Amino acid sequence: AQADIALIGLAVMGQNLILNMNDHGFVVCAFNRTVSKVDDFLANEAKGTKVVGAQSLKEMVSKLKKPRRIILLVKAGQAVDDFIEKLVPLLDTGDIIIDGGNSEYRDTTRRCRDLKAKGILFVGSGVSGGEEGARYGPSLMPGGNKEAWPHIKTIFQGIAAKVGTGEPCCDWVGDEGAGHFVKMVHNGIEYGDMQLICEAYHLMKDVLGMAQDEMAQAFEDWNKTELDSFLIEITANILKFQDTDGKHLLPKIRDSAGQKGTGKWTAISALEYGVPVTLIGEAVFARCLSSLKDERIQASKKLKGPFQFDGDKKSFLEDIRKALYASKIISYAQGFMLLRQAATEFGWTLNYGGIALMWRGGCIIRSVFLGKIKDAFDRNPELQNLLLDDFFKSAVENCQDSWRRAVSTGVQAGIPMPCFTTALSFYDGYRHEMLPASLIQAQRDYFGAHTYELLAKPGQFIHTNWT
């Protein structure tokens, strides 16, 4: 037994993770169901390294130091269960299987429980960063059976992306499917951040009449303060990019972002668990709307909008920045509410601060803002809503006049802002002690005798004879 860890699945992600582990001084045993791929890898991408191969699962297992650690990086679904089924008879009590694929969190929960009962420790880990990230520094989001954590922490944190202060973008997320649940929410959050940037762009372009390079410079400027983030960095770069003919490329690109994307699962989860994750929902629906390109061409010939901007451009541009920032705060508050609800549903203990850190590093959504979320949970690990943290409370308070102006102006101009508006609507709802939902309760009691509760006596159900 000379190998520190094994990885099954030699597509590019797996190869790159193996090479990353190798760089960090670990001896990795590579395996693939089509075994010829092992030799190919050893002869090529892994030539000259400490990587060793195996020609069967039994051989692979035999090469591993106990407790044995085996990473699965294969196609999500049946391929994962099939490898688990083949591995179990070969392993000893206390050995560890880590699924790093894009698996559905309920499958991860099932596997964790079933393997625990058989004496096998199971980890389901989110992996973010794509192929480059895998190779040099992914974000890793491990959850499952925490008995495994002390045995995988050194390798996982070693290979993970680090932030500038040195902390690894990898820590124990929580129980069972929590790691994969967190990856799912991350995917939805990404949709939100992208849509928010798009709305800011649309306001710059169509309310302020800004030039492409001017908008690039605005995003570059924005990237120097609170909004500092990878998505804003690349947006600036995209905006100034010129095609071979000297014309800007972005205006030539088809505005259809797809109807079937994975972000939908975050919004579906929110609806399943009854959490008001409104911004990610609008971001998903905005991609769907964009996909109706021919329908929008037709509608644009038949349906009319309202306007001419008269004001200080620099000021309104700043209003857009602050609207974006406040809306982003609401989106993440909502995402963390969903995490909190899953914790409640399944009895999971979630590393909220660590999750914020894990979403930096290799993740597309990486930002300084995420460090502020970590700070909030470090200040109060019992924090119940991001909006209650003094930093975020202050930020929203300082942004809200600008936010309202940006939204009011966009509305008068006919610019669609499904995410800015849902975020503001949510903020205004969340902060109200009294909402008109009592009218819904009265309506249902009126038409169906479904009963309502009095404010003074919650939990007691009353029917009134309204007629």
Curated annotation (Swiss-Prot):
Entry-linked SMART domains: 6PGD
Binding-site positions, NADP(+): 9-14, 32-34, 74-76, 102
Active site: 183 (proton acceptor), 190 (proton donor)
Chief localisation class: cytoplasm
Cellular compartment(s): Cytoplasm
Modified sites of kind N6-acetyllysine: 37, 58
GO molecular function annotations of the record: carbohydrate binding; carboxylic acid binding; NADP binding; phosphogluconate dehydrogenase (decarboxylating) activity
UniProt-listed Enzyme Commission number(s): 1.1.1.44
Function of the protein: Catalyzes the oxidative decarboxylation of 6-phosphogluconate to ribulose 5-phosphate and CO(2), with concomitant reduction of NADP to NADPH.
Record's subunit section: Homodimer.
Name recorded for this polypeptide: 6-phosphogluconate dehydrogenase, decarboxylating
Organism of origin: Homo sapiens
Gene from which the chain derives: PGD
